[PDB]
């Protein structure tokens, strides 16, 4: 059923974490910046490859539809769990199976987001189905699905 207004806002939030200058386009420099913030080390040719896979208009940057297309391909076939587990590990830095409030704050700080203790606690609450104050792997998965 129908793409929803809230779904769109979620995608727009993700786009804004890349598009830090809010000019409406994601460059290879912006892609690289976010990826390195998340502990990755892509090469220039790898960033170009990412953009070329979805650069429908050939202008060398990513616009909103092209960004959605990137996402749709990523989210398509995740049953191996390889990709989801890689993303979870970004957050679960100590590898203990639970994303703590401190761990979430680390990632949000790396992404350039200023948040209060109360804001981050509310984020945990959103994902924290079992109420234990931390986000496990299944809870993380459910945040993408849900």
């Amino acid at each position: 059923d129908q793409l929803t207004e809230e779904q769109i806002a979620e995608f727009k939030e993700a786009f804004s974490l890349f598009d830090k200058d809010g000019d409406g386009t994601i460059t290879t420099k912006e892609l690289g910046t976010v990826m390195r913030s998340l502990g990755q080390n892509p090469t220039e040719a790898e960033l170009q490859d990412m953009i070329n896979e979805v650069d429908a208009d050939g202008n060398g940057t990513i616009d909103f539809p092209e960004f959605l297309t990137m996402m749709a391909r990523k989210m398509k076939d995740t049953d191996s769990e390889e990709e989801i587990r890689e993303a979870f590990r970004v957050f679960d830095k100590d590898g203990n199976g639970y994303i703590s409030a401190a761990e979430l704050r680390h990632v949000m700080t790396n992404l350039g987001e200023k948040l209060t203790d109360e804001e981050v606690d509310e984020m945990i609450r959103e994902a924290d189905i079992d109420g234990d104050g931390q986000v496990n792997y299944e809870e993380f998965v459910q945040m993408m699905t849900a």
């Binding site: 809230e6 806002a9 979620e10 995608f11 727009k12 939030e13 993700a14 804004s16 974490l17 890349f18 976010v34 990826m35 998340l38 990755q40 990137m70 996402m71 990523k74 989210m75 990709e83 989801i84 890689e86 993303a87 970004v90 957050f91 979430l104 990632v107 949000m108 992404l111 987001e113 948040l115 804001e119 509310e122 984020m123 609450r125 959103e126 994902a127 993380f140 945040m143 993408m144």
Partner: peptide, 20 residues
């Protein structure tokens, strides 16, 4: 008002794209 669900979903989606 700050929407924690949107914020966390946006960050998760970003991290998924930033993966191999």
């Amino acid at each position: 008002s700050f929407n924690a669900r949107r914020k966390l979903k946006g960050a998760i989606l970003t991290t998924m794209l930033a993966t191999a």
